[PDB]
Design a protein around this ligand. Sequence first.
Ligand SMILES: CC(=O)N[C@@H]1[C@@H](O[C@@H]2O[C@@H](C)[C@@H](O)[C@@H](O)[C@@H]2O)[C@H](O[C@@H]2O[C@H](CO)[C@H](O)[C@H](O[C@]3(C(=O)O)C[C@H](O)[C@@H](NC(C)=O)[C@H]([C@H](O)[C@H](O)CO)O3)[C@H]2O)[C@@H](CO)O[C@H]1O
Ligand SMILES: CC(=O)N[C@@H]1[C@@H](O[C@@H]2O[C@@H](C)[C@@H](O)[C@@H](O)[C@@H]2O)[C@H](O[C@@H]2O[C@H](CO)[C@H](O)[C@H](O[C@]3(C(=O)O)C[C@H](O)[C@@H](NC(C)=O)[C@H]([C@H](O)[C@H](O)CO)O3)[C@H]2O)[C@@H](CO)O[C@H]1O
Ligand SMILES: [Cl-]
Ligand SMILES: [Cl-]
Ligand SMILES: [Cl-]
Ligand SMILES: [Cl-]
Lengths: 194, 192
Amino acid sequence: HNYKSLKYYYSKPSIELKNLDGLYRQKVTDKGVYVWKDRKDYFVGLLGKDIEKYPQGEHDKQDAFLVIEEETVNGRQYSIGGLSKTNSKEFSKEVDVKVTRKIDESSEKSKDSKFKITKEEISLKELDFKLRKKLMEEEKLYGAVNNRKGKIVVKMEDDKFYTFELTKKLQPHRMGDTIDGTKIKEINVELEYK
Amino acid sequence: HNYKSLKYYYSKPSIELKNLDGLYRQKVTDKGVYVWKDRKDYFVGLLGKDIEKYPQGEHDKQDAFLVIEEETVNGRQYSIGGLSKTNSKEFSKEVDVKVTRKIDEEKSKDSKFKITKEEISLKELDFKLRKKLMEEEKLYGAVNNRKGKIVVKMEDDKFYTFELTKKLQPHRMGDTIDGTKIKEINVELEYK
Ligand SMILES: CC(=O)N[C@@H]1[C@@H](O[C@@H]2O[C@@H](C)[C@@H](O)[C@@H](O)[C@@H]2O)[C@H](O[C@@H]2O[C@H](CO)[C@H](O)[C@H](O[C@]3(C(=O)O)C[C@H](O)[C@@H](NC(C)=O)[C@H]([C@H](O)[C@H](O)CO)O3)[C@H]2O)[C@@H](CO)O[C@H]1O
Ligand SMILES: CC(=O)N[C@@H]1[C@@H](O[C@@H]2O[C@@H](C)[C@@H](O)[C@@H](O)[C@@H]2O)[C@H](O[C@@H]2O[C@H](CO)[C@H](O)[C@H](O[C@]3(C(=O)O)C[C@H](O)[C@@H](NC(C)=O)[C@H]([C@H](O)[C@H](O)CO)O3)[C@H]2O)[C@@H](CO)O[C@H]1O
Ligand SMILES: [Cl-]
Ligand SMILES: [Cl-]
Ligand SMILES: [Cl-]
Ligand SMILES: [Cl-]
């Protein structure tokens, strides 16, 4: 799958729900949870290791980063992953974003920018979505069919990293993975298009 | 994962739909396809590269092996993987199944497994073979009866393994193999 799907998913708005009123794993055989805040409810798929994070019952102090999928599930609007523990305190860390952009087959230009991390525990879904939007706005990502190549690498304070490939949508089973936002050190982006 | 989720999936009945009336990938955005036969329609999920077998549009000459999930999707019953090309010719082969206990004395109890499809999903092989073991070898009959493996061996020694302590993974449910090239099935049970 390529340009058409990418431009389509990444052009959707997201819904950021902090301090959910509910996050309920009705039964162990459900591959998702019911989430709600105020008067809007959703079914959220747990398609990765996140299924182990929310066993049968109610779960308090959670946030949800939703991007409404095309399919209805259990008669509700559906989103995949994007669940995380809510902040125990206000948090905001600015990290460097190094962008390396193709000029031609021989050279590349380096530009620097910043990105703010406002959650203590953040899902890969949310990082991936926000960083690609940032690139759609500032670097013409998905502005043309040729503008789809490269990657985003989130580097942590230790040797760990996480990569988002610009040629494909983040995979469902990775959307529920979370990382410690307080330990994100820098973000490096390689854009392989003029 | 635990005995409870294993027993729950493999104790389900399957619905085998040969010669589907249709299979349809509606938008390229969708993460599965619609299948239907005789006024019943279903939505079938396809993970990873399994979705690439069915580009946007309608596809004929397909079979579906369905195990209904708890979720409804687009108002339809849902299943994961299990799609394959229907037979172009008649085919049937009785494959030896050799069951050995890896605990005590070791000797195998042998039986046969009938293959009738030229192209067969790992979902179907996995599901039918574990069901055969539940019926003949007490698989999942007690919490300690869940260790071992099933190995599907091909004519050229390629093989596919199903570990009995876990449910077949969703990305493998949509994988297909050549039914005509299955040579034998070897099972190891690690419970008494
Ligand atoms: C066809 C396809 O999509 N296959 C999936 C895998 O992607 C494919 O294979 C990998 C190796 C790459 O070549 C992909 O470009 C290729 O499409 C997928 O593997 C995961 O792919 C992503 C990028 O999409 C990434 O490379 C993952 O590697 C890391 C990462 O950089 O993100 C490697 C890091 O060391 C690791 N970090 C830590 C702390 O362990 C992370 C981390 O495990 C994940 O990011 C957490 O979600 O992964 C690579 O695993 C594969 C698994 O998602 O699924 C295939 O279907
Ligand atoms: C934690 C987890 O579930 N990880 C998944 C992998 O399983 C883990 O690692 C493997 C190597 C085993 O040790 C598992 O016990 C362990 O959970 C998973 O790997 C795939 O696991 C299955 C068993 O579940 C199997 O070993 C696969 O290897 C083979 C196979 O024997 O079936 C190796 C064969 O040579 C190969 N055959 C051919 C013709 O290439 C097959 C074949 O590719 C697949 O059967 C087709 O589906 O694979 C092993 O790859 C991994 C990939 O599915 O997912 C991890 O999440
Ligand atoms: Cl529905
Ligand atoms: Cl990715
Ligand atoms: Cl890097
Ligand atoms: Cl397995």
